[model samples]
Target: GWNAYIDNLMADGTCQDAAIVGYKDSPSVWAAVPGKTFVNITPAEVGVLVGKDRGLTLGGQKCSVIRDSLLQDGEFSMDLRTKPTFNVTVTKTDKTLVLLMGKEGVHGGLINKKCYEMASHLRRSQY
Candidate 1:
Protein backbone atom coordinates (compact mmCIF):
# COMPACT_ATOMS: atom_id res chain seq x y z
CA GLY A 1 0.00 0.00 0.00
CA TRP A 2 3.06 2.29 0.02
CA ASN A 3 2.31 3.45 -3.44
CA ALA A 4 2.69 7.11 -2.64
CA TYR A 5 4.96 7.45 -5.63
CA ILE A 6 1.91 7.07 -7.82
CA ASP A 7 -0.09 9.52 -5.76
CA ASN A 8 0.73 12.13 -8.34
CA LEU A 9 -0.32 9.80 -11.14
CA MET A 10 -3.80 9.19 -9.81
CA ALA A 11 -3.94 12.64 -8.28
CA ASP A 12 -7.61 13.12 -8.97
CA GLY A 13 -8.60 9.68 -7.69
CA THR A 14 -7.44 6.16 -7.10
CA CYS A 15 -5.68 4.36 -9.95
CA GLN A 16 -8.68 2.19 -10.71
CA ASP A 17 -8.14 2.91 -14.38
CA ALA A 18 -4.89 4.81 -14.07
CA ALA A 19 -2.21 2.62 -15.55
CA ILE A 20 1.61 2.78 -15.40
CA VAL A 21 3.22 1.98 -18.69
CA GLY A 22 6.96 1.37 -18.34
CA TYR A 23 9.57 -1.22 -18.95
CA LYS A 24 9.32 -4.24 -16.66
CA ASP A 25 11.82 -2.92 -14.16
CA SER A 26 12.00 -3.70 -10.47
CA PRO A 27 9.71 -1.86 -8.09
CA SER A 28 12.73 -0.19 -6.56
CA VAL A 29 13.62 1.12 -10.00
CA TRP A 30 10.07 2.37 -10.59
CA ALA A 31 8.89 3.04 -7.05
CA ALA A 32 5.83 1.32 -8.40
CA VAL A 33 2.35 1.76 -7.11
CA PRO A 34 0.71 -1.20 -5.58
CA GLY A 35 -1.87 -2.92 -7.76
CA LYS A 36 -0.67 -1.16 -10.88
CA THR A 37 -0.71 -2.86 -14.23
CA PHE A 38 2.62 -2.53 -16.05
CA VAL A 39 2.30 -2.18 -19.79
CA ASN A 40 5.32 -2.69 -22.04
CA ILE A 41 5.84 -3.79 -25.61
CA THR A 42 5.55 -7.55 -25.25
CA PRO A 43 8.39 -8.34 -27.66
CA ALA A 44 10.85 -5.71 -26.48
CA GLU A 45 9.91 -6.10 -22.84
CA VAL A 46 10.31 -9.83 -23.14
CA GLY A 47 13.18 -9.61 -25.61
CA VAL A 48 15.57 -7.16 -23.92
CA LEU A 49 14.99 -9.22 -20.83
CA VAL A 50 14.62 -12.92 -21.58
CA GLY A 51 15.97 -13.20 -25.09
CA LYS A 52 19.35 -11.55 -24.64
CA ASP A 53 21.85 -12.70 -22.08
CA ARG A 54 22.73 -9.05 -21.27
CA GLY A 55 25.19 -9.99 -18.61
CA LEU A 56 27.03 -7.29 -16.71
CA THR A 57 30.29 -8.58 -15.37
CA LEU A 58 31.36 -8.21 -11.77
CA GLY A 59 34.09 -5.80 -12.98
CA GLY A 60 31.61 -3.49 -14.56
CA GLN A 61 32.26 -5.25 -17.86
CA LYS A 62 29.71 -5.88 -20.62
CA CYS A 63 28.59 -9.30 -21.79
CA SER A 64 26.50 -11.03 -24.38
CA VAL A 65 23.83 -13.78 -24.77
CA ILE A 66 26.55 -16.47 -25.23
CA ARG A 67 25.06 -17.17 -28.65
CA ASP A 68 22.73 -19.78 -27.14
CA SER A 69 20.15 -17.71 -25.23
CA LEU A 70 19.99 -15.32 -28.21
CA LEU A 71 17.79 -17.31 -30.51
CA GLN A 72 14.46 -15.56 -29.97
CA ASP A 73 13.90 -11.87 -30.55
CA GLY A 74 10.81 -11.99 -28.27
CA GLU A 75 8.68 -9.08 -29.49
CA PHE A 76 4.94 -8.61 -28.75
CA SER A 77 2.23 -6.61 -26.90
CA MET A 78 1.17 -7.45 -23.33
CA ASP A 79 -0.94 -5.98 -20.52
CA LEU A 80 0.40 -7.19 -17.19
CA ARG A 81 -1.30 -6.71 -13.88
CA THR A 82 1.26 -5.53 -11.29
CA LYS A 83 0.81 -5.43 -7.55
CA PRO A 84 3.36 -4.82 -4.81
CA THR A 85 3.39 -7.15 -1.84
CA PHE A 86 3.59 -6.02 1.76
CA ASN A 87 6.28 -8.61 2.30
CA VAL A 88 9.53 -8.23 0.39
CA THR A 89 11.86 -11.17 0.33
CA VAL A 90 15.32 -11.66 -1.22
CA THR A 91 17.70 -14.52 -1.77
CA LYS A 92 20.76 -14.98 0.42
CA THR A 93 22.78 -13.35 -2.38
CA ASP A 94 20.25 -10.55 -2.30
CA LYS A 95 20.26 -10.50 -6.09
CA THR A 96 16.78 -11.67 -6.91
CA LEU A 97 13.32 -10.35 -7.69
CA VAL A 98 10.70 -12.41 -5.93
CA LEU A 99 7.03 -11.95 -5.13
CA LEU A 100 4.88 -13.87 -2.71
CA MET A 101 1.93 -13.52 -5.05
CA GLY A 102 -0.40 -15.04 -2.48
CA LYS A 103 -3.64 -13.68 -3.91
CA GLU A 104 -2.81 -10.83 -6.29
CA GLY A 105 -1.15 -13.39 -8.53
CA VAL A 106 -4.25 -15.38 -9.36
CA HIS A 107 -5.74 -12.29 -10.95
CA GLY A 108 -3.22 -12.20 -13.80
CA GLY A 109 -2.61 -15.83 -14.83
CA LEU A 110 0.43 -17.39 -16.52
CA ILE A 111 1.11 -14.63 -19.00
CA ASN A 112 1.69 -12.26 -16.11
CA LYS A 113 4.20 -14.61 -14.55
CA LYS A 114 6.09 -14.84 -17.80
CA CYS A 115 6.46 -11.08 -17.94
CA TYR A 116 7.49 -10.95 -14.30
CA GLU A 117 10.11 -13.65 -14.65
CA MET A 118 11.61 -12.09 -17.74
CA ALA A 119 11.72 -8.70 -16.07
CA SER A 120 13.32 -10.21 -13.01
CA HIS A 121 16.03 -11.83 -15.04
CA LEU A 122 16.65 -8.65 -16.99
CA ARG A 123 16.91 -6.66 -13.78
CA ARG A 124 19.52 -9.04 -12.43
CA SER A 125 21.68 -9.33 -15.53
CA GLN A 126 22.15 -5.78 -16.72
CA TYR A 127 25.39 -4.12 -17.75
Candidate 2:
Protein backbone atom coordinates (compact mmCIF):
# COMPACT_ATOMS: atom_id res chain seq x y z
CA GLY A 1 0.00 0.00 0.00
CA TRP A 2 2.77 2.41 0.88
CA ASN A 3 4.63 1.38 -2.23
CA ALA A 4 1.62 2.14 -4.37
CA TYR A 5 1.28 5.62 -2.93
CA ILE A 6 4.95 6.26 -3.50
CA ASP A 7 4.74 4.98 -7.03
CA ASN A 8 1.81 7.27 -7.84
CA LEU A 9 3.68 10.25 -6.49
CA MET A 10 6.81 9.36 -8.39
CA ALA A 11 4.79 9.14 -11.58
CA ASP A 12 3.65 12.69 -10.99
CA GLY A 13 7.25 13.83 -10.41
CA THR A 14 6.54 15.28 -6.98
CA CYS A 15 7.50 12.95 -4.18
CA GLN A 16 10.09 13.86 -1.57
CA ASP A 17 10.97 12.42 1.82
CA ALA A 18 8.21 10.20 3.17
CA ALA A 19 7.72 8.93 6.69
CA ILE A 20 5.08 6.86 8.47
CA VAL A 21 4.07 7.96 11.95
CA GLY A 22 2.66 5.24 14.13
CA TYR A 23 0.10 6.21 16.71
CA LYS A 24 0.46 4.40 19.99
CA ASP A 25 -3.22 4.44 20.90
CA SER A 26 -4.61 3.53 17.52
CA PRO A 27 -4.09 1.38 14.45
CA SER A 28 -3.57 4.47 12.35
CA VAL A 29 -0.38 5.23 10.49
CA TRP A 30 0.08 8.79 9.28
CA ALA A 31 1.85 9.42 6.03
CA ALA A 32 3.76 12.65 5.78
CA VAL A 33 6.02 14.14 3.14
CA PRO A 34 8.17 17.22 3.32
CA GLY A 35 6.57 19.19 0.51
CA LYS A 36 3.08 19.38 -1.08
CA THR A 37 4.13 17.41 -4.11
CA PHE A 38 2.33 14.19 -3.25
CA VAL A 39 -1.31 13.63 -2.40
CA ASN A 40 -1.59 14.34 1.29
CA ILE A 41 -3.62 11.66 3.06
CA THR A 42 -4.27 10.32 6.49
CA PRO A 43 -4.16 6.64 7.46
CA ALA A 44 -7.96 6.34 7.47
CA GLU A 45 -8.09 7.80 3.98
CA VAL A 46 -5.55 5.31 2.73
CA GLY A 47 -8.07 2.49 3.09
CA VAL A 48 -10.59 4.32 0.98
CA LEU A 49 -8.02 5.15 -1.66
CA VAL A 50 -7.11 1.53 -2.21
CA GLY A 51 -9.84 -0.58 -0.68
CA LYS A 52 -12.74 0.54 -2.82
CA ASP A 53 -11.40 -1.35 -5.81
CA ARG A 54 -11.46 -4.59 -3.82
CA GLY A 55 -14.94 -4.00 -2.32
CA LEU A 56 -13.47 -3.56 1.12
CA THR A 57 -14.53 -0.93 3.63
CA LEU A 58 -12.20 0.68 6.08
CA GLY A 59 -13.24 0.64 9.69
CA GLY A 60 -11.48 2.34 12.58
CA GLN A 61 -11.93 4.23 15.80
CA LYS A 62 -12.59 7.86 15.13
CA CYS A 63 -9.97 10.24 16.44
CA SER A 64 -10.46 13.91 17.04
CA VAL A 65 -9.80 15.93 13.94
CA ILE A 66 -6.54 17.80 14.16
CA ARG A 67 -7.46 21.38 13.53
CA ASP A 68 -5.10 23.69 11.72
CA SER A 69 -5.44 26.26 14.50
CA LEU A 70 -4.59 23.74 17.18
CA LEU A 71 -1.63 22.61 15.18
CA GLN A 72 -0.16 26.04 15.81
CA ASP A 73 -0.32 25.53 19.57
CA GLY A 74 0.06 22.88 22.23
CA GLU A 75 2.89 20.77 23.58
CA PHE A 76 2.82 17.04 24.17
CA SER A 77 5.03 14.60 25.98
CA MET A 78 4.99 10.85 26.35
CA ASP A 79 6.82 8.97 29.08
CA LEU A 80 7.59 5.32 28.52
CA ARG A 81 8.35 3.34 31.63
CA THR A 82 10.00 0.15 30.53
CA LYS A 83 13.33 -1.34 31.58
CA PRO A 84 14.96 1.80 30.23
CA THR A 85 12.49 4.69 30.41
CA PHE A 86 12.55 7.67 28.08
CA ASN A 87 10.57 10.86 27.50
CA VAL A 88 9.36 12.06 24.13
CA THR A 89 8.51 15.74 23.84
CA VAL A 90 6.56 17.26 20.99
CA THR A 91 6.47 20.97 20.48
CA LYS A 92 4.27 23.03 18.20
CA THR A 93 7.02 24.48 16.09
CA ASP A 94 8.60 21.09 15.63
CA LYS A 95 6.25 18.57 14.09
CA THR A 96 8.60 15.68 14.57
CA LEU A 97 8.16 12.40 16.40
CA VAL A 98 10.99 11.10 18.55
CA LEU A 99 11.46 7.49 19.60
CA LEU A 100 13.69 6.75 22.55
CA MET A 101 14.50 3.18 23.51
CA GLY A 102 15.57 2.94 27.12
CA LYS A 103 17.50 0.24 28.94
CA GLU A 104 17.03 -0.42 32.61
CA GLY A 105 20.39 -1.19 34.16
CA VAL A 106 23.96 -0.78 32.99
CA HIS A 107 24.77 -4.45 32.51
CA GLY A 108 26.91 -4.04 29.40
CA GLY A 109 27.28 -7.65 28.32
CA LEU A 110 23.75 -8.75 29.16
CA ILE A 111 22.16 -5.63 27.75
CA ASN A 112 24.20 -5.87 24.58
CA LYS A 113 23.08 -9.43 24.02
CA LYS A 114 19.47 -8.55 24.68
CA CYS A 115 19.65 -5.62 22.30
CA TYR A 116 21.23 -7.78 19.63
CA GLU A 117 18.53 -10.41 19.98
CA MET A 118 15.77 -7.83 19.79
CA ALA A 119 17.29 -6.21 16.72
CA SER A 120 17.72 -9.57 15.06
CA HIS A 121 14.08 -10.46 15.64
CA LEU A 122 12.92 -7.13 14.28
CA ARG A 123 15.03 -7.53 11.14
CA ARG A 124 13.71 -11.01 10.58
CA SER A 125 10.11 -9.92 10.94
CA GLN A 126 10.56 -7.12 8.43
CA TYR A 127 11.40 -9.54 5.64
Candidate 3:
Protein backbone atom coordinates (compact mmCIF):
# COMPACT_ATOMS: atom_id res chain seq x y z
CA GLY A 1 0.00 0.00 0.00
CA TRP A 2 2.70 2.46 0.97
CA ASN A 3 4.88 1.57 -1.98
CA ALA A 4 1.96 1.85 -4.35
CA TYR A 5 1.00 5.19 -2.94
CA ILE A 6 4.49 6.59 -3.29
CA ASP A 7 4.77 5.17 -6.78
CA ASN A 8 1.57 6.85 -7.77
CA LEU A 9 2.82 10.11 -6.37
CA MET A 10 5.99 9.72 -8.35
CA ALA A 11 4.04 8.87 -11.48
CA ASP A 12 3.10 12.54 -11.78
CA GLY A 13 6.82 13.33 -11.87
CA THR A 14 6.71 15.71 -8.94
CA CYS A 15 8.46 13.45 -6.48
CA GLN A 16 10.45 11.42 -8.96
CA ASP A 17 13.90 12.84 -8.31
CA ALA A 18 13.28 14.42 -4.96
CA ALA A 19 15.30 14.67 -1.80
CA ILE A 20 14.18 14.39 1.81
CA VAL A 21 15.10 16.51 4.81
CA GLY A 22 16.11 14.55 7.85
CA TYR A 23 17.58 15.25 11.24
CA LYS A 24 19.69 13.38 13.73
CA ASP A 25 19.90 13.82 17.47
CA SER A 26 23.58 13.09 18.00
CA PRO A 27 24.55 16.40 16.49
CA SER A 28 21.02 17.72 16.77
CA VAL A 29 21.35 18.66 13.19
CA TRP A 30 19.37 18.51 9.96
CA ALA A 31 20.42 17.28 6.55
CA ALA A 32 18.88 16.77 3.14
CA VAL A 33 19.65 13.80 0.93
CA PRO A 34 18.59 12.69 -2.50
CA GLY A 35 15.60 10.46 -2.79
CA LYS A 36 15.43 7.26 -4.79
CA THR A 37 16.15 7.85 -8.45
CA PHE A 38 17.72 4.69 -9.78
CA VAL A 39 15.62 2.09 -7.96
CA ASN A 40 12.35 2.02 -6.13
CA ILE A 41 12.17 3.29 -2.58
CA THR A 42 10.29 1.38 0.06
CA PRO A 43 7.98 2.80 2.71
CA ALA A 44 10.24 1.28 5.33
CA GLU A 45 13.15 3.33 4.07
CA VAL A 46 11.11 6.48 4.22
CA GLY A 47 10.14 5.39 7.68
CA VAL A 48 13.79 5.21 8.54
CA LEU A 49 14.29 8.82 7.55
CA VAL A 50 11.30 10.13 9.40
CA GLY A 51 11.70 7.68 12.23
CA LYS A 52 15.24 8.77 12.89
CA ASP A 53 13.89 12.23 13.63
CA ARG A 54 11.27 10.84 16.01
CA GLY A 55 8.53 10.32 13.45
CA LEU A 56 5.30 12.15 14.26
CA THR A 57 7.11 14.45 16.63
CA LEU A 58 10.25 16.02 15.20
CA GLY A 59 11.14 14.77 11.71
CA GLY A 60 7.48 15.13 10.70
CA GLN A 61 4.59 12.76 10.02
CA LYS A 62 4.55 9.67 7.91
CA CYS A 63 2.47 8.71 4.90
CA SER A 64 0.33 6.66 7.25
CA VAL A 65 -0.51 9.89 9.03
CA ILE A 66 -1.36 11.76 5.86
CA ARG A 67 -4.84 11.46 4.39
CA ASP A 68 -5.00 13.53 1.25
CA SER A 69 -2.50 14.76 -1.34
CA LEU A 70 -2.79 18.04 -3.18
CA LEU A 71 -0.94 19.86 -5.91
CA GLN A 72 -0.70 23.54 -5.10
CA ASP A 73 1.45 26.26 -6.61
CA GLY A 74 3.07 23.56 -8.73
CA GLU A 75 4.06 21.70 -5.60
CA PHE A 76 2.74 18.47 -4.19
CA SER A 77 1.32 19.25 -0.79
CA MET A 78 -0.02 17.00 1.90
CA ASP A 79 -1.71 17.63 5.20
CA LEU A 80 0.00 15.52 7.84
CA ARG A 81 -2.05 16.19 10.91
CA THR A 82 -3.92 13.85 13.17
CA LYS A 83 -4.32 14.94 16.78
CA PRO A 84 -1.36 17.32 16.09
CA THR A 85 0.59 18.13 12.79
CA PHE A 86 1.90 20.20 9.90
CA ASN A 87 2.35 20.29 6.14
CA VAL A 88 4.85 18.64 3.79
CA THR A 89 5.60 19.94 0.34
CA VAL A 90 7.10 18.14 -2.61
CA THR A 91 8.46 20.66 -5.09
CA LYS A 92 7.86 20.35 -8.82
CA THR A 93 11.36 18.97 -9.03
CA ASP A 94 10.29 16.39 -6.44
CA LYS A 95 12.22 17.63 -3.44
CA THR A 96 10.50 16.90 -0.12
CA LEU A 97 10.55 19.33 2.77
CA VAL A 98 8.49 19.01 5.90
CA LEU A 99 7.17 22.20 7.43
CA LEU A 100 6.22 21.80 11.01
CA MET A 101 3.68 23.99 12.90
CA GLY A 102 2.35 25.43 9.69
CA LYS A 103 2.62 29.20 9.20
CA GLU A 104 4.99 29.97 12.04
CA GLY A 105 7.25 27.01 11.60
CA VAL A 106 7.29 27.21 7.84
CA HIS A 107 8.52 30.78 8.04
CA GLY A 108 10.92 30.05 10.81
CA GLY A 109 14.64 30.28 10.18
CA LEU A 110 15.24 26.63 10.93
CA ILE A 111 12.85 25.28 8.34
CA ASN A 112 14.06 27.84 5.82
CA LYS A 113 17.57 26.57 6.31
CA LYS A 114 16.44 23.06 5.53
CA CYS A 115 14.79 24.10 2.29
CA TYR A 116 17.66 26.33 1.25
CA GLU A 117 20.22 23.62 1.82
CA MET A 118 18.14 21.16 -0.14
CA ALA A 119 17.54 23.54 -3.03
CA SER A 120 21.20 24.45 -3.17
CA HIS A 121 22.33 20.86 -3.38
CA LEU A 122 19.65 19.77 -5.83
CA ARG A 123 20.47 22.64 -8.16
CA ARG A 124 24.14 21.79 -8.03
CA SER A 125 23.57 18.11 -8.68
CA GLN A 126 21.32 18.83 -11.62
CA TYR A 127 23.76 21.20 -13.27
Candidate 4:
Protein backbone atom coordinates (compact mmCIF):
# COMPACT_ATOMS: atom_id res chain seq x y z
CA GLY A 1 0.00 0.00 0.00
CA TRP A 2 2.79 2.44 0.89
CA ASN A 3 4.80 1.70 -2.22
CA ALA A 4 1.76 2.14 -4.39
CA TYR A 5 0.81 5.39 -2.67
CA ILE A 6 4.35 6.78 -2.84
CA ASP A 7 4.69 5.80 -6.50
CA ASN A 8 1.46 7.52 -7.28
CA LEU A 9 2.58 10.68 -5.51
CA MET A 10 5.90 10.66 -7.36
CA ALA A 11 4.24 10.04 -10.73
CA ASP A 12 2.02 13.03 -10.17
CA GLY A 13 4.91 15.15 -8.96
CA THR A 14 3.16 15.60 -5.65
CA CYS A 15 5.74 13.83 -3.55
CA GLN A 16 9.37 14.91 -3.32
CA ASP A 17 11.04 13.03 -0.47
CA ALA A 18 8.73 10.30 0.65
CA ALA A 19 9.60 7.28 2.74
CA ILE A 20 7.54 4.70 4.55
CA VAL A 21 7.84 4.26 8.33
CA GLY A 22 7.38 0.97 10.11
CA TYR A 23 9.05 -1.83 11.96
CA LYS A 24 8.11 -5.33 10.75
CA ASP A 25 4.48 -4.59 9.95
CA SER A 26 2.82 -1.67 8.19
CA PRO A 27 4.61 1.67 8.00
CA SER A 28 3.21 5.16 8.22
CA VAL A 29 4.47 8.74 8.46
CA TRP A 30 2.80 11.62 10.26
CA ALA A 31 1.96 15.02 8.93
CA ALA A 32 4.59 17.62 9.74
CA VAL A 33 3.34 20.08 12.31
CA PRO A 34 4.44 23.63 11.64
CA GLY A 35 6.16 25.50 14.44
CA LYS A 36 9.50 26.75 15.64
CA THR A 37 10.15 23.59 17.62
CA PHE A 38 8.65 20.16 17.25
CA VAL A 39 8.22 17.88 20.22
CA ASN A 40 7.28 14.23 19.75
CA ILE A 41 6.51 11.52 22.23
CA THR A 42 5.36 7.93 22.13
CA PRO A 43 1.98 6.58 23.14
CA ALA A 44 3.63 4.96 26.08
CA GLU A 45 5.15 8.24 27.18
CA VAL A 46 1.84 9.91 26.76
CA GLY A 47 0.27 7.22 28.83
CA VAL A 48 2.85 7.62 31.52
CA LEU A 49 2.40 11.33 31.58
CA VAL A 50 -1.34 10.95 31.68
CA GLY A 51 -1.21 8.24 34.28
CA LYS A 52 -2.40 5.41 32.05
CA ASP A 53 -1.18 1.89 31.59
CA ARG A 54 -1.48 1.85 27.83
CA GLY A 55 2.19 2.69 27.52
CA LEU A 56 4.04 0.16 25.43
CA THR A 57 7.42 -0.23 23.79
CA LEU A 58 8.18 2.31 21.12
CA GLY A 59 8.75 1.03 17.56
CA GLY A 60 9.48 2.18 14.00
CA GLN A 61 12.06 4.05 11.90
CA LYS A 62 12.44 7.57 10.55
CA CYS A 63 13.09 8.44 6.93
CA SER A 64 13.27 11.60 4.90
CA VAL A 65 11.00 12.00 1.95
CA ILE A 66 10.80 15.08 -0.24
CA ARG A 67 14.42 16.10 0.23
CA ASP A 68 13.89 19.30 -1.72
CA SER A 69 10.37 20.04 -0.66
CA LEU A 70 10.98 20.81 2.99
CA LEU A 71 10.24 24.51 2.73
CA GLN A 72 7.01 23.95 0.84
CA ASP A 73 3.71 24.43 2.58
CA GLY A 74 1.57 21.33 2.76
CA GLU A 75 0.59 18.50 5.02
CA PHE A 76 2.18 15.05 4.99
CA SER A 77 -0.49 12.71 6.28
CA MET A 78 -0.07 9.06 7.12
CA ASP A 79 -2.51 6.41 8.20
CA LEU A 80 -0.87 5.50 11.49
CA ARG A 81 -3.35 3.07 12.89
CA THR A 82 -0.55 0.52 13.13
CA LYS A 83 2.52 2.69 13.42
CA PRO A 84 4.19 5.30 15.63
CA THR A 85 3.59 9.01 15.43
CA PHE A 86 6.47 11.12 13.99
CA ASN A 87 7.44 14.61 15.04
CA VAL A 88 9.50 16.32 12.39
CA THR A 89 11.03 19.77 12.17
CA VAL A 90 13.19 21.82 9.86
CA THR A 91 15.94 23.65 11.68
CA LYS A 92 16.19 27.40 11.55
CA THR A 93 19.03 27.05 9.07
CA ASP A 94 16.66 25.17 6.80
CA LYS A 95 19.51 22.89 5.86
CA THR A 96 18.60 20.10 8.23
CA LEU A 97 15.36 18.36 9.00
CA VAL A 98 15.23 16.44 12.20
CA LEU A 99 12.80 13.68 13.01
CA LEU A 100 12.15 12.73 16.61
CA MET A 101 10.84 9.27 16.05
CA GLY A 102 8.96 7.36 18.71
CA LYS A 103 9.45 9.72 21.57
CA GLU A 104 5.91 8.95 22.62
CA GLY A 105 4.72 6.48 20.07
CA VAL A 106 5.47 3.20 18.40
CA HIS A 107 8.17 4.64 16.20
CA GLY A 108 10.33 5.56 19.17
CA GLY A 109 10.54 1.91 20.12
CA LEU A 110 11.38 0.59 16.68
CA ILE A 111 13.65 3.47 15.68
CA ASN A 112 16.65 2.04 17.47
CA LYS A 113 16.41 -1.13 15.41
CA LYS A 114 14.87 0.00 12.13
CA CYS A 115 16.58 3.37 11.60
CA TYR A 116 19.55 1.80 9.80
CA GLU A 117 17.32 -0.15 7.48
CA MET A 118 15.28 2.93 6.73
CA ALA A 119 18.35 5.03 6.09
CA SER A 120 19.73 2.34 3.79
CA HIS A 121 16.55 2.35 1.80
CA LEU A 122 16.63 6.12 1.49
CA ARG A 123 20.20 5.98 0.23
CA ARG A 124 19.39 3.32 -2.36
CA SER A 125 16.43 5.30 -3.57
CA GLN A 126 18.37 8.56 -3.54
CA TYR A 127 15.97 10.27 -1.20
TM-score for all models, in order of appearance: 0.21, 0.21, 0.27, 0.23
What TM-score quantifies how close candidate 1 is to the native fold? 0.21
Local accuracy of candidate 3 as per-residue lDDT tens digits, 1-127 = 2233233333433232223332222212122222432123334444443432322332333433352232344333333332433333332223333322223233323333443343444445541
- Runs of candidate 3 exceeding 4 Å displacement: 1-19, 22-67, 70-73, 82-92, 95-127
User: Which clashing pairs does model 1 show?
Assistant: 42-76, 43-74, 43-75, 43-76
- Model 1 regions lying over 4 Å from their true place: 1-5, 17-29, 39-127
lDDT-based ranking, best first?
3, 4, 1, 2
lDDT of each: 0.28, 0.28, 0.33, 0.29
Scored by lDDT, the top model is: 3
Residues 22-119 of candidate 1 have per-residue lDDT tens digits of 33343222233344322212324333433334431111212232222223234222232222421111111122222211132233333334334444
Model 2 score (lDDT): 0.28
Instruction: Report the lDDT tens digits of candidate 2 across residue range 7-103.
Output: 3323433222222333333424343343431123344543332232322111221222211121322222222222232211111112222111223
Clash number for each model: 4, 2, 0, 20
Candidate 4's residue-wise lDDT over 1-127, tens digit each? 3355334323433222233332212222332222311223243322321232211222233333222222334421111121234422221111112233334434323432333333334444444
